[PDB]
Amino acid sequence: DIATLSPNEQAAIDAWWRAANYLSVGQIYLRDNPLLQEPLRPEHIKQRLLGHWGSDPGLSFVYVHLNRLIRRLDLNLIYVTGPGHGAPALLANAWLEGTYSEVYPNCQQSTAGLQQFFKQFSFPGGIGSHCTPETPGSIHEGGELGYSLSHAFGAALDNPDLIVACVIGDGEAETGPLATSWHSNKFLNPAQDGAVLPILHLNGYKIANPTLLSRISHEELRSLFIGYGYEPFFVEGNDPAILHGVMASTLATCVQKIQAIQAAARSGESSDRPMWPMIVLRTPKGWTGPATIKGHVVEGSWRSHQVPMADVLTNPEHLQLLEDWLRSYRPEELFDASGAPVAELQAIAPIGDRRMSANPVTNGGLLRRALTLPDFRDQAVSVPAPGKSRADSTRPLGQFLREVIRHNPDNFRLFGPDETASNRLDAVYEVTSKVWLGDRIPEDEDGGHLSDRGRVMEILSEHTLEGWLEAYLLTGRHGFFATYEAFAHVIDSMVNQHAKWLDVSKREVDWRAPVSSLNILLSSTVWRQDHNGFSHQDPGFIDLVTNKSARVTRIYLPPDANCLLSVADHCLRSTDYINVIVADKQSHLQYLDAEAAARHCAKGIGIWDWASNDQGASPDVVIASCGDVVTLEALAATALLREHFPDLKIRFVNVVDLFRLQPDTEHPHGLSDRDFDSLFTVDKPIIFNFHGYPWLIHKLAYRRHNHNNLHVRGYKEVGNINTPLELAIRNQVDRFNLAIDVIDRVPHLRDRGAHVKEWLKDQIHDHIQYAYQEGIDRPEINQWQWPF
Amino acid sequence: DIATLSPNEQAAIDAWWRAANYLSVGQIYLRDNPLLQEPLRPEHIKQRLLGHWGSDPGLSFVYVHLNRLIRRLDLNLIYVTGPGHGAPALLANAWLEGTYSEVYPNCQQSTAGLQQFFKQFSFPGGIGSHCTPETPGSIHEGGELGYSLSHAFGAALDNPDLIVACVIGDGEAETGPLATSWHSNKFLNPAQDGAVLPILHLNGYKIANPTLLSRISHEELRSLFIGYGYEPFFVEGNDPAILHGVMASTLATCVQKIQAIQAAARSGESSDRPMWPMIVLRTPKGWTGPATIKGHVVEGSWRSHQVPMADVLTNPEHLQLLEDWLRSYRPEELFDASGAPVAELQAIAPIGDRRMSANPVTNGGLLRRALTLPDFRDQAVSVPAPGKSRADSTRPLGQFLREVIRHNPDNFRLFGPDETASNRLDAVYEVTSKVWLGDRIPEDEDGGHLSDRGRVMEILSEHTLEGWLEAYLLTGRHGFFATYEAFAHVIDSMVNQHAKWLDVSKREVDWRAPVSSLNILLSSTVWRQDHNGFSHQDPGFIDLVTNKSARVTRIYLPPDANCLLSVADHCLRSTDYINVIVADKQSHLQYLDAEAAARHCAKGIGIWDWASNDQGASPDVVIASCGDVVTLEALAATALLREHFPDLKIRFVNVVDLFRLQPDTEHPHGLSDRDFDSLFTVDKPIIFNFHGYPWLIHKLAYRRHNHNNLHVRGYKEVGNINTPLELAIRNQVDRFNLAIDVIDRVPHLRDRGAHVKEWLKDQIHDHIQYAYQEGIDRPEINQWQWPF
Amino acid sequence: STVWRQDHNGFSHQDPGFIDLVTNKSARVTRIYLPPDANCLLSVADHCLRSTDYINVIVADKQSHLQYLDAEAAARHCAKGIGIWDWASNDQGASPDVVIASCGDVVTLEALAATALLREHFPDLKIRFVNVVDLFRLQPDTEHPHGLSDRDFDSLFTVDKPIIFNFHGYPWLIHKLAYRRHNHNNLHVRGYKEVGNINTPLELAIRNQVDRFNLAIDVIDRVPHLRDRGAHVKEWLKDQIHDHIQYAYQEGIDRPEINQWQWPF
């Protein structure tokens, strides 16, 4: 009897459906007189109309039907909204369920509450027109389109009984990120994870053009969505009397198959990739609004996308049409005198946490358990002498991540775009593998590292991975993203969205608990260009992240493996941040042991006393580095200067936290003027060697008292192919150019260092000539060790 | 069957009782090995013991019995703890009920959760030893004793079905604030408010002395507590087998009488002051711990107050006694292997919001509805000419408060220590009256303004009034406190406690929602000394409040009635602050109309253009005032200077927000250096006339670029009796001394203003001589108006 | 019982604010004494049991503490109310580079420990140690006869060297008392700001920046010929702050060498 729809139940569901639309339209238009007790007047209409209408009925259409199956089958559901402009529909149902009144006591279920509820939407000092963090039961802001689908899969991970109902607009489906995220079914495990129920809201139109997926034939539509690995179900029409029963049956069909798929997998009898059920919903745009405006068809057309009538404040004719639109919902039979929904509506409202707007998963910070972090000092490489030993920088991190996975079998995950092996993090493969539910071959047994139980997820689409991870954190869990720095620009749009979400959730919204940080590891830099990656890779992603703020993003550039461990250990505890860690996978020198590394990362920036020779004296120059390749060149330059200028006093400063350079006025995390003057003196030149665009340092540290003595060398440009030393020579960040820069800046070396400066230019000439002759650097360059 | 206790139920209750004690002792002592699976070793004991034990069993003893009646009679209860050092008992029951795990997912109900639960208590980076805001279901921090009782009555207000079980230690009862707060029964309305169930924990001892209330005879104890208006019930003994049944019966007896009292009152058949039930509980201190230590009796003695054995880390003998103490609870039969309580314990655990640790009343900010504030401009007095008309300053505020009460019949209240009539706020009496359930006489009909339905509360004890209001706010409601400035020092201790509570709730605790502000109106100043109040009243309370922070307290000194309205309207919307408004009740000049007043209070500080004559030019001096009496003298001095020095250019600045003077580095609310330099120039003398101790201005504004030109005149001292002008002359804040101060500071007036300065001193001589001759000031002083 | 050595009893956010309230009355009716050790406490109590028309407020701590002055030296110190400690100083016959002043007993210990740290790492640095018992001596003699003269104040605290004042109370109270002095622009007061819920004695001093390590850092910042030369020591001092906080969060108490610190030299 679950598939069939009772006429009595059909009426109450239809009653809820119209009331949700009525509240949605009231939010768009009304600022006063919520229930039409008195004739509508221009003083009740909002001056500026920013809400969108063409998607609201469809979202409410599915939402009321989703609540039906929760009441019947006791399903645990989440609502993820593709078109973020359909916010009124979600809020209206949130208010109808009673969630919004509990979260916001001002907007009660009354006439006075409705006046506040209607006036707040898309209003200065109110709430936005998208699924902002202020929305109860919202994890995804659909303002930027293409990421709703991935967030459904991310939230589904390690939530076996959860079902995430993600509604997808046809226009959104034309975007690149969402077209590739359909293949996320291959990495979702039916045994341990929940289900995603994709609903294609094929209203037929974008803002102003028809959606191609609508204008592509039905046969090719089913062909496209079986090739994605889904079992597609089609509900088409325009008359709700037929569509109420038809749609209810389809949703009943889908849930049984989802449970049948999960029952088959968890029993172990069918350990294969299943054909997940997906719904294709073709309904008119602006479904229950005006039919035509000014002789142009509006309903079921792109003209209904935002607002069918935007001149209602001007001419009374549309004003009467607006009031006629509102009364078509028959609000008199939907709300009582007080302003609450009628008891028929309250009957079909789910109860407590079973409500999709009050599910604690959406406010994931309440479901967040801190990771049991093993002591990273067990994985710290031994550094008996600083800078005299070489070890692979990322491998200790891989071993540390291995022990985190061991102690957090479900709460932690790894995400990587087919680069985990290249990034040299294979230590995690010793305890787990990579997720794969596609076809398997015996050749995968040797080094495939493929298993459905794996805690590491791999796909070449960087958009898919970022959406997977962001949803995983917002549901109250932990993760770590590792990728090349060359392709970081691909996810720049997605990072902005998540940073937006975190910043609002901290300051504006008070009831949203903190979630875990977004930890990103840019594992291959632009200085050590390996085989893969384009020639002109740029560090520009770092500039984009620092663009957001110091109070939501953190940038770490640890010099060695022990600093990488301390940084990763520190950032696996921080909550409301986007942590971007820039480290290189090549074999590098090691500088700090576990104790010294931990103190260094706690400060974020500090003097290296072994690399300095200014103890108990005023340094003639401060050499600072931020990175690992540039740190090596800065250290090598320091060694050269001390050989040729024994009396020269050099203070070596290494900075790991980029944002420490900002003054404490901008953010509390930054250094004070006294602290900054202690590290970098008030009047001596600073030769800063930065892994990135040099101006980023100037943007951060322009307010310092010694900024006029700050001289930053960083990434400028590249040739087609360069050796590691030649590439550093092109950007003037190599050891020889840095030594020349120190000679130019130190006042008592311009006259005295001329002969050394000529010798340094000779070395630049010799190494370039050798590079063009052999294709690599000289052995003494590759095996350079810290002297002294 | 509710009164009698079943043996099966007695066992489960006793099982819960011991488990709560066991967790309490574990928190005090253990940092590792929560369940005694392995022999106790010194590495499991906490290094420093800061918890208190002598009160923990008593609190848990009542708590388990309170949960009994919640499960039986479905009562809505709150736990308010007198002795705040009994925090472990509350936390243990909070953990047992499951509340703590939901709020804190790290401290789960397992062995691993218990390890975190035990290690956190009284630990660096953990939680405190008192009922801090981090405690679930806590409104009152009992660290400072004497205010638990008043907070019970405050939370009870306008919560008719709530019952607040407040446990009171006998030592606490010796304090002044709690002895007088027993009479709060007379102001609690059984018809509209809930009940308070006072439980006297008469353990017989303080920290080191016997409690007098224990050593006073039982007959005189019952005599004392019937004189307070309570029906006292006595439960005495030391054997829990008898005391379990006896005390269950007594609690059953009390609830029925409380419901009978409420049933009689709400039916209207008995509208008299009832004899509320109160429990006197005499149990040994350190009830279930060691009997004797080193030959000294510990249990049932002051030696058990904090820690019965504090050398357990030193000698193994006490270490074995400690482990013997833990095993007396028989933990093997109380927790399973995993670390959760046994299913017998879970049976008697209340469910959901019926749990006293998860009652949403305690986290009152979730229950907070913003006040429907009428437009204050309806009550604004007309000021056609600034400073040329006189009106009573506080009466418009009384009318505004009247309209707030009208639109907020239950959410708002007034609190005053027998000064509302004196403060001239009688406009509120037009709609409501004052609470009184004592004897009534026909003489009260004329101007008594007494009724049980009143929204204004009056009692001469300032301590109990402050406790009433703080609890009212922390339960999610609104209020306004009006009192003299002379007696503000009385509540200084209480204000510190509430400010402490707010500051932690904002920064540390994340799940506690904001509550309404604490609004205090110091309605009678020290300059206009009326009949009542001692001669040497000081403004020192203002200095005490500014000690706390600019981020939790705000000080407002509005000059006129319209500024008082804007300030009160602004502060009735702010949430997490202690707002202290200093205004005077006397007839004063009016300076700003509704529009100009609102702009002024929005800035908090700004130039008065009508009182200035420096438009389009650099002012020779800046005259600033903060208050209303000192504003009049500053204005009168400005008038004198302009009459005698027509070329002199004076900028008049009035400051309402005191904390705007602090630089923006300390707090965002403060002015920037550019903004401050705009109001007070970078190089001209500032003659600041402050209502308070002059050093407070220097503390706030010492970092400003022009602080070396800041010259503050304020309250120094008083004589026995002075006229308003003579008192200002003694403190050198009158118009004549201010004009002299301007002459001294302006560089081009030292030579040129000598003759005027002599004339000004003549006026000081003349007015003092007239004051000693007549006892009042001259008519031209009392009726001074702004010229020009 | 002071607020720095938080005992079992008492609320977490106890404040020294009562001292500020008393100083609001006058120097001619109230006296505030903060004796550093037991002998100084005896002389103060003996002196105040003879005075007639005053409110004497004596701030002392009950915990086990170091002892600094014997009966003869203690009595001379209380008679002055404020004086140089010659054993804790190393500037005899020379101009001190910095004046370290303390007012209290816990803050005196941290001020002494900071002095010991500075002398170990900067042997050439000359430090004058001043201890304050009578708070109101800091007020100039113009306000009250009991206060020090300008010449007397300049002798203790020089006219041009930085003063690192470690006060048991709100730091602004020192500025209210001694704003008129010729060297007030070089007076840098560290006192009670705020507390956490529960702290170890060293951690609580670290939160308020009155511990030995923060004071040593403050001296490095203020002394003109140490900004360049003391950078490496300042980094080491911050490492000690990091290490002791980490140990505090790990064990719940301070390290044994902190609890059993003695005056070297």
Ligand SMILES: Nc1ncnc2c1ncn2[C@@H]1O[C@H](COP(=O)(O)OP(=O)(O)NP(=O)(O)O)[C@@H](O)[C@H]1O
């Ligand atoms: N004051 C500044 N504000 C912003 N960006 C700056 C500033 N000075 C330099 N830069 C940037 O820093 C990079 C190179 O300049 P800089 O780091 O100052 O090295 P430099 O050797 O000192 N060059 P110059 O300052 O012209 O002598 C470029 O990206 C510049 O745009």
Ligand SMILES: Nc1ncnc2c1ncn2[C@@H]1O[C@H](COP(=O)(O)OP(=O)(O)NP(=O)(O)O)[C@@H](O)[C@H]1O
């Ligand atoms: N720098 C300061 N710090 C603290 N309090 C101060 C300071 N300067 C002045 N005061 C206080 O302010 C009051 C009077 O000083 P002030 O406000 O500067 O006016 P004034 O006429 O300039 N007196 P003066 O500074 O001595 O010439 C007294 O109560 C002083 O204690």
Ligand SMILES: Nc1ncnc2c1ncn2[C@@H]1O[C@H](COP(=O)(O)OP(=O)(O)NP(=O)(O)O)[C@@H](O)[C@H]1O
């Ligand atoms: N002139 C002053 N008048 C009143 N209080 C002051 C003054 N100067 C500093 N303070 C207070 O002293 C405390 C710390 O400042 P201070 O004692 O001068 O040490 P400091 O390290 O020099 N701080 P700063 O002066 O801002 O560089 C704060 O609580 C200030 O409010």
Ligand SMILES: Cc1ncc(C[n+]2csc(CCOP(=O)(O)OP(=O)(O)O)c2C)c(N)n1
């Ligand atoms: C890549 C991209 N191009 C354009 C837009 C502008 N935009 C915002 S909402 C929206 C409508 C999405 O179309 P559809 O999925 O059909 O949504 P619905 O019909 O449900 O409104 C568009 C085009 C966008 N957000 N992203």
Ligand SMILES: Cc1ncc(C[n+]2csc(CCOP(=O)(O)OP(=O)(O)O)c2C)c(N)n1
């Ligand atoms: C006015 C005051 N004096 C002293 C103290 C110190 N103090 C803190 S807790 C406490 C014990 C309270 O005694 P009692 O009510 O007998 O408590 P219980 O035996 O339940 O611990 C004391 C004296 C205080 N908080 N307030």
Ligand SMILES: [Mg+2]
């Ligand atoms: Mg569309």
Ligand SMILES: [Mg+2]
């Ligand atoms: Mg007691």
